[PDB]
Amino acid sequence: DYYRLLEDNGVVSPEVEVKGGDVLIGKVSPPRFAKRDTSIVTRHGENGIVDLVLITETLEGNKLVKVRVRDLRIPEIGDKFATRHGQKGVVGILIDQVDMPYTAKGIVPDIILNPHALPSRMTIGQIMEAIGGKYAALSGKPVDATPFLETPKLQEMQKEILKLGHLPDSTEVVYDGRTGQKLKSRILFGIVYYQKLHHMVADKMHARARGPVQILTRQPTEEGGLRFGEMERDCLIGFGTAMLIKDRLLDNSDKAVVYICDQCGYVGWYDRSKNRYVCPVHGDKSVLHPVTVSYAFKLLIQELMSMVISPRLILGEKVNLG
Amino acid sequence: IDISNHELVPKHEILQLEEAYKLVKELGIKPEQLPWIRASDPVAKSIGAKPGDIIKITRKSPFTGESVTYRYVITG
Amino acid sequence: LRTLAQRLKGKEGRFRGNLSGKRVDFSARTVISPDPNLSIDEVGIPYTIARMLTVPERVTNINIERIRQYIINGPDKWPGANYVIKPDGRRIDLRYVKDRKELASSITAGYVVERHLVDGDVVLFNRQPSLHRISMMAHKVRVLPGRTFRLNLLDCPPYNADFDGDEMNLHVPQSEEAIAEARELMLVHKNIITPRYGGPIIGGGQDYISGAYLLSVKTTLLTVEEVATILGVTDFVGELGEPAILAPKPYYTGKQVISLFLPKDFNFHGPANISKGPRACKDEICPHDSFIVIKNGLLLEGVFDKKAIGNQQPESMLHWSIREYGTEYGKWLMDNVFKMFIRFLEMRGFTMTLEDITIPDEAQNEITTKIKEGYSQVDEYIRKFNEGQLEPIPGRTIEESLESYILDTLDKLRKVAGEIATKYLDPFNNVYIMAITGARGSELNITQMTALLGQQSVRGERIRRGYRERTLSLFKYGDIAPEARGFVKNSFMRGLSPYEMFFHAAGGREGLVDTAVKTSQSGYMQRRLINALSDLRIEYDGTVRSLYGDIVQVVYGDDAVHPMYSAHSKSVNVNRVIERVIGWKR
Amino acid sequence: RHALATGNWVGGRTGVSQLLDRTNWLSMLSHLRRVVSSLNFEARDLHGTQWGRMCPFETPEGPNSGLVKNLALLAQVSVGINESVVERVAYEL
Amino acid sequence: DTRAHLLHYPQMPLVQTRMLGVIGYNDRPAGANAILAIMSYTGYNMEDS
Amino acid sequence: SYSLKTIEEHFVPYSIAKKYIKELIDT
Amino acid sequence: GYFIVNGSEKVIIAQEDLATNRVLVDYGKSGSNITHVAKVTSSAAGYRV
Amino acid sequence: MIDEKLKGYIDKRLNEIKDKIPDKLHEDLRAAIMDINGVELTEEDIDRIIDLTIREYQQSLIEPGEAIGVVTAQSVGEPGTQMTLRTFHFAGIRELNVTLGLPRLIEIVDARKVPSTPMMTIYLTDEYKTDKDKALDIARRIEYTRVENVVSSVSVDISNMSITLQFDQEMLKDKGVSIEEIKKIITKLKLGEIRIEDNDEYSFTIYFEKIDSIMALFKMREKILNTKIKGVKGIKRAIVQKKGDEYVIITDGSNLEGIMNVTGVDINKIQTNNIHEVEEVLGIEAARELISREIKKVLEEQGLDVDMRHIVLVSDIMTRTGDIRQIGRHGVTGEKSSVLARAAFEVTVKHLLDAAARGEREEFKGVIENIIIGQPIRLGTGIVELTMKPNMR
Amino acid sequence: TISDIEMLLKDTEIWDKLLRNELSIEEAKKMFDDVARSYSKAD
Amino acid sequence: MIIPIRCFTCGAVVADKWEPFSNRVMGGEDPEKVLTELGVNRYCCRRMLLSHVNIIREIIHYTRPI
Amino acid sequence: TIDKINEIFKENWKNKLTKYEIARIISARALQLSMGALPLIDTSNLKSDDVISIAEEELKRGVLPITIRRIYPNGQVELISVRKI
Amino acid sequence: MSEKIIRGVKFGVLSPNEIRQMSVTAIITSEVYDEDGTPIEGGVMDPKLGVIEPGQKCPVCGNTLAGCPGHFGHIELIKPVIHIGYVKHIYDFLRSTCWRCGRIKIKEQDLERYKRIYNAIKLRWPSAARRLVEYIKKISIKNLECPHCGEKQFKIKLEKPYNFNEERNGSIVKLSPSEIRDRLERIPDSDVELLGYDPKSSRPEWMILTVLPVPPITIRPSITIESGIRAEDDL
Ligand SMILES: [Mg+2]
Ligand SMILES: [Zn+2]
Ligand SMILES: [Zn+2]
Ligand SMILES: [Zn+2]
Ligand SMILES: [Zn+2]
Ligand SMILES: [Zn+2]
């Protein structure tokens, strides 16, 4: 199913939808030490359309193939936008034209910014740029805002804004879109320049269900899981929960069961052929008990055993006994 | 010189053996499990504290006014 | 070469990378976006996160029918199921099942249905670096369209979370015992009051404070339609009652609208945040409604501010109400009343303009005269220093005395100019309202935006770095005038001169690195303290003995009172009890 | 080529050559006009000598605050000449 | 390019400094002018949103 | 979960073993 | 102002460092037998001392 | 305006309840009810007041099994990300530079022997506290002013093998020590057979007999310049400051015994920035009190609030062993009575090998190592154990 | 320094003996005073 | 790149007004009068017409072969 | 008789139930109900089918038979019942 | 066969007998793989040690990748070598006791009193016990004559990391690891117990490596990236 869209020559044709792990270039490799697949798999998260396909000959004489895939990004909730003054922020919500508060002339905002962002940050240049952009759109004359020398000054800009037909202080009468009722106060309107940053929420999501683990540590990574870590462990300790710590640090990662000999304490194994437990040191004569531990602890025990350190695990009754 | 009059120094007292026995029985601890103070500390030397004893210290605290803590006297 | 002693040593080793902290399953990380509509103990999750992260939910005879629905809907439709586990232990993938209805009819008690996250599910939620205890809290799932986690605004302080694009982590606990412990202990509303001090960590942000203040002003009047629109957002149905003004026109006062939510036996007599300066009369008789008077659950006087509903404010009206009526009432009040505040601010109109920071020309001339007087005084000090007639402060050298004189004179000049600008400023501006109410403002910010920036100091001293005896090539050799060494007489409204802007940048350079070094130092110190103090426990006799048996304190805190349940630093605020009992007739 | 592609340099310094940043025009221009300090709280501080040579605002936030700067609008780096001619003219003076 | 971005309808700034035309930024713009209203319309714009 | 400790153990009665197994079969 | 190496646009960032072949004087560390230090960095053709 | 019968009833009820609340809370409650005026009080109001007070105190009590250690550690460490080195100078003394903030807290919890920028607050006795001049004199008496500060110039002549010292008139008066005292001190040094000539006023010259090499001459000069004229060791400068009807001395150095020996200073009220010398002199309880007060001060200057109970617990756990012990790997964290937790705190192998050699066994009674293997901890939900009989359900 | 360790040993042994109620308070007080007098004389 | 069909703020067609406005402004007429008599009075449309780059003229040279 | 505050603490926590014990009871009851234990309260007329909610309602009612034995550090053991008949 | 909890871990030095008994094979072949790529028996990548490829039976146990704990091997060193991690401990053993008999260089009555005190408070006061142990070690290093033998003792100096130099006549001589092992083996168990160590769990001669354990394949898996050639762990 993954080779459906691959052309006969082995490279995907332009202007085709590429979803998930579709292959773009089909390559077979002979072994270094019988063909093997080194074909390109499109990144699992990324979905897009093939834009361009390029075929060339390298200097040494090898065939070089490049495939460029385009993906359309429509702004959404969580996308990061920033002005020319240092006011970075995600999109809280997308509001329809009907819901946005319209003015007497019917002009609705493209972006609404909380006034409380202004006084602590002390960015007066943003309001100055809003007024300047309003004046530039109204009068049509160029606005120069070079530091220490601006043409025209603020007062002439306000006077011309009043002359063109709007309020001198760049505010204007605003009616609530949802209810139709005029606001008790005027609202400042401007044309501040905004830029869309490349920290989109589309590629910033990392979520993991049950999946693969490492061959050595038997812990989940690559989609990889979020590391819990010491500080979150201490937060969980601080709340006093015990089964939650056990779930978050033992059940969902490197959950293992190991059979331990009673006498020497070294880790044994269960033999599938014969139901009897087997101890590496004691052979068959000793009894072995199963204990559920993190596989990381077993790895630590075996790494200490690769040293001359000899950790002997001491078993105890699971019940409180008493 | 006498240092017990300093503002930082709380009130140190040496309590009798019966009171120490009652304290360790009520707390359910061995005497060495209490926080311990060296017998060479000047505050313990001023009251002539001996090793193996328990010192009752009253500190000025804003929550209860006077707080009673018990220290163990160790050797050096 | 890495060897078997380097494998478990250093960072990314066995001890820290695997044993102390390990990667976990059923975890998601996503950008956060604001959402005031959700409750404080709720988190909004995308549909994809709900579909991919699952919950076991072992089948029992009570939920069987409901569980059957989760199997009728496939892995792609929400709510639905992703896997089904027989009692035999054989996992089945719902995606490859030939017919889901026949399998749904087959299930009985003992089965497990790995299903999508539904509304009401509890999930752990935290933001790095996870400093204090409540930085990881249990939230109730609400599935919303979009692709970002939506956190309630009132939950921003506990996580120290602000919406710059910084992401947040969500863990889905699988075990039934884990879910129960998360619900009964780590629920958000149960942890409104921080354990650090006896004060609410959840409360009104900057916008909530402004909305509450403007709703609680003595001059506000609301018609019946406006009151209905305001109360629509809240989950309140009941008799509005007779409007506070019956003739000539029926008007509801904002305090009357607010008082419908206060408990019917609640007495408070604290001052408001606006009564922090000259306008305070320190009594309930001030014509300015700066003294909050609540009797029998009626907001009879005063306005709500940072000292009434604000976060991180111990001994506030919100803190007392929570402490006396439980965290469930606290959450109910937060949701409903704060949504009401935001709705009123929506329908009144709050904006930022240049007129409210612009001072009149007369104020500018007065500030210029004060600046000239200060410059003359500093020049006289410099002349006396050069002539040798300067009298040093005892215990200090001549240069130290001169520098102290100059710095004190310039600081007094800045304070005086700020006072002049505030006096000539409009009595009630949007920036002024933000500053006085505690809604994201300060007096120094007003002074710097209106009056003048003031002295810009790097590492606690005037700007000295530069050429020999010159901080900058624009000035004369060996110039100690205020304007030379990083003193800015221009506000941000007026605009900074080139050298003034350079000195401002030099002054502000330090924070950019101080925050970075502070983060690492604080993390290291906190790790040390946690590793040292982890073993302590409170026992049934009040002792604080450790797990190894060593006793640390005979009584915890000398009164066995947890800071979380104490009224600020006091186990019982006796004056608060006196208020609770006899406040209505006070 | 091995020095330019990898960026690891002969003299022991690292990160000499970096892939050109082309998110937009401004990123490319800034990355072209960038001076990285090889090396303290004193070095991060803005010096009065930087007037007209380095931008006081453009600097990264964090461990690199004050160590990575951008060449000013009217700042030129000296190309250098032979010392012998200047020595001769000074001796002749 | 391994990672490229394109804004479909970029606009040159209305409020332009002198050096904007020198560096050719107004010929390769990286944003768009947005009608901005400084007001607290709903509460989804709090905390730098 | 299964800790077995034998106290005051008594010998198995061969004559009464038939009675014991009959009682077990009855149960 | 950039090279094209292996198809990638690689640019050599400017590297700022203390002037070579010049002697800079500074005080020695406090509480030590050393009272004053002067360091000179001679940049030879191919090596630095 | 409380009636006498009302006061008697109040006293009766308070004496009835005195066994259910702390003595200080009882005193605070009794003081508060008497203070109430301007409003009529009745029997039911007093009963309700007392019941509410007792119930609030009972609700405020801590809960058994609380993981108070981790809560206290987080409550102390979290403001670290908010503590800044905003202020560099002590109180109104711009001249004195003191570290106070996150680095100060780190060096407090690390039990450093000598603090960065040590400081001392010396309170004058009742005789010298009122007057400014005597306070200035006693502060100037103790400053550790060496010869090198006083001398304007030093010159060395080889042919005469002489050292000429020239002094400033004002600078000599500023220190307040006469040149005759300086010459007497130099004679008291007596490192060799020396001749001293008066030479010019506020100057003199010294020759030697067995001077030997000029290297010895220059070493002798360095010894002469590094000679203390007056003042006890360790103090750089002392500044008289006003605290309200009383003048104290702020000191840039820390020497508790030396200042205690100075006449005119009361030994009872002396504040020292460092916590080790007070522990050596005033015992361990005074050290714990000073540790708590210093941490409280550091948290106060940043303007943020942290409860005193957490600070008290931290100071108690620092001084549990009879001496101020470092929180880190050499101290209370160093002795956890466990091996896995010790090896996990700092990533090292030496502790595991040491435990293997000594044959030490880990009891697993703590928290850190229980999480490592997977068994539940004994904090909070761990402490409670349940018993259930399902027969009668 | 061996005197201090031996005194600590003797004191903890006397305390454990008291915790087992082998003998009353007064005799234990005599033992404490006797050992302190005996092994502070050496120091 | 190419002028948007409709004003972003209000769904008013401004694409058809690009050619007349640009041609007349390039001819030597002040943009204010041209905009006023062209039929755009809201400044939301004026910023659409005034601040446009017309990148599409340069791109047609550098077009993907596809 | 360690201290007055200790006595106040001990007599306060005799008749009350800490949140850790409540959480443990709820988690144990939820685990029991998940495996197949029959609920004691009436199954019907409950708005929530969740096992956690049923266990919480059972604890609030007091039907479930659970006795908490708390071991004091001095060896004393206290039994607290949840039946509340 | 009942599920149990872990009460604790008993740490100790792994004796050569335990290494030989626990190991499933003796490694004698230098080569790791064959010419065709099949692993060679008796080499480092012995299939007996463990299995990492899924779906492969383990010869020792028969389990798949999951359920195979990994089985140790052992190599017999021709000459004993000093374990680096224990050098300090070995150092503390060398200078404390004489080479002639191995007894502590302390009078017998003092040894008896010290043993009694240590045994009395080895567990009650670990800090005081450690102080007593270091005092005994200090007074043993200070004495340069064995009371039991009378043989003259030579100062032993450790040059980092593992070089031991003995002052024989007027010249330094390097102490061979075999001679060090003999000296350690001559030390009695009671003297080792007095020095703070546990004679049963750890013995000084076990700190000198006669047999070296070969870790299982499970903890040093051979990772083969698809693009690259087979890669082996640094171990
Ligand atoms: Mg953020
Ligand atoms: Zn065995
Ligand atoms: Zn007023
Ligand atoms: Zn438009
Ligand atoms: Zn195997
Ligand atoms: Zn011998």
Numbering used by the authors:
A (entry chain B): 785 to 817, 829 to 1017, 1022 to 1121
B (entry chain H): 9 to 84
C (entry chain A): 295 to 880
D (entry chain B): 393 to 431, 437 to 490
E (entry chain B): 687 to 735
F (entry chain F): 2 to 28
G (entry chain B): 148 to 196
H (entry chain C): 1 to 393
Question: Paper's wording?
Answer:
Here, we present the high-resolution structures of the inhibitors RIP and TFS4 in complex with the 13-subunit RNAP from Sulfolobus acidocaldarius.
We could resolve RIP encompassing residues 10–127 (of 145 aa) within the RNAP–RIP complex, and the secondary structure content of RIP is in good agreement with CD-spectra recorded with free RIP which predicted a predominantly alpha-helical structure. The compact structure of RIP allows it to fit snugly in the DNA-binding channel of RNAP between the Rpo1′ clamp, and the Rpo2 protrusion and lobe motifs, respectively, on each side of the channel. The C-terminal tail of RIP forms an intricate network of interactions with the RNAP clamp and rudder motifs with an interface area of 1127 Å2 that includes both hydrogen bonds and hydrophobic interactions. The RIP tail makes a 90° bend at residue N117 and the region L114–M119 adopts an unusual L-shaped conformation that fits into a pocket between rudder and clamp. On the opposite side of the DNA binding channel, RIP interacts with the RNAP Rpo2 protrusion and lobe motifs mainly via hydrophobic interactions and with a small interface area of 302 Å2. The insertion of three additional residues, L99–D100–T101, allows the α6* helix to fold partially back on α5, and project the C-terminal tail inside the DNA-binding channel of RNAP. A superposition of the RIP-RNAP structure with the closed PIC (from yeast, pdb 6gyk20) reveals that the C-terminal tail of RIP (residues 117–123) and the helix α4 overlap with the TF(II)B residues 90–120 encompassing the B-linker and B-linker helix, respectively, by adopting the same structure and equivalent binding mode to the RNAP rudder. Consequently, RIP inhibits the PIC by competing with TFB binding to RNAP.
